[PDB]
Structures are given as C-alpha cells and as structure tokens.
Design a protein around this ligand. Structure first.
Ligand SMILES: Cc1cc(F)cc(C)c1Oc1ccc(C(C)(C)O)cc1-c1cn(C)c(=O)c2cc(-c3cnc(-c4ccccc4)[nH]3)oc12
Length: 108
C-alpha cells in the first residue's frame, strides 16, 4: 500500500514462503545435518527467508534496500555453493523470478 518494508513482509515474503520450492530456504542451511564442512567457509554471509522474516518482524532493517540485498544474498549464496543445473539451483531460480515479479509492484 505505502511503506516498503510492510509490503516486503505482507506481500513479497508471504508469496515466496507459500511457494512449493520455499522449504529449503525457510531456515539456515544446517551444514552439520547435511554433511557440508566447507559451506560456512565458502559462504561468508549466509541467508534464508527464515532470518529475513525475523528481521522484518524485529525492525532490524534500516530500509527496504537492505532487506532486498538479503534476498539477493540468499539466491547468489545458493548459486555460488551449488553446481548450475542442481535441483536446489532450479528451485532458487524459480523463487528469484517470482521475487523480482513481486518487487516491481513495490510502493514509493
Ligand atoms: C533441496 C534439496 C533436495 C534434495 F533432494 C536434497 C537436498 C539436500 C536438498 O537440499 C536441502 C535439503 C534440506 C535442507 C535443510 C532443510 C536440512 O537445511 C537444506 C538443503 C539445502 C538448502 N540449500 C539452500 C542448499 O544450498 C543446499 C545445498 C545442499 C547440499 C547438500 N548436499 C550437497 C551436496 C554436496 C556435495 C556434492 C553434492 C551435493 N548440497 O543442500 C542444501
């Protein structure tokens, strides 16, 4: 409607969260459970919709552009660590496309 961060929480995040392919990005990549010793060495700034959701609820972000940066970090993190063509990458790509659709309808 008017405030940007409100939009990001109530519209953008809700849409991405409901999506079929959301579940692997709803919490930090648990690198112990998954047997990934190198993840937290390669990915300097980890990110998930879980953490973004927390930050929107907890008046953490200075402004919408900081939150959008985190969404991009989540996607690019996935594309850095994983081989192009992997299942997880196609899922990230699907969410990214939808993310960018919803970001165009953003108030100002
Ligand atoms: C989405 C998905 C499908 C699948 F069939 C198998 C896995 C591991 C998978 O990814 C995850 C499943 C669960 C979780 C939880 C919820 C436990 O955190 C995370 C992932 C997962 C999420 N993200 C964002 C990743 O980038 C990633 C990478 C891996 C991964 C696990 N093992 C590998 C891998 C390592 C070396 C060689 C080949 C694959 N990659 O798993 C995930």
């Amino acid at each position: 409607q008017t405030n940007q961060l409100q939009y990001l929480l109530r519209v953008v995040l809700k849409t991405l969260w409901k999506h079929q392919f959301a579940w692997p990005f709803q919490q930090p990549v648990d690198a112990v459970k998954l047997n990934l010793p190198d993840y937290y060495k390669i990915i300097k700034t980890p990110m998930d919709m879980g953490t973004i959701k927390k930050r929107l609820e907890n008046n953490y972000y200075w402004n919408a552009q900081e939150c959008i940066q985190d969404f991009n970090t989540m996607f690019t993190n996935c594309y850095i660590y994983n081989k192009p063509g992997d299942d997880i990458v196609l899922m990230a790509e699907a969410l990214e496309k939808l993310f960018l659709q919803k970001i165009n309808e953003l108030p100002t």
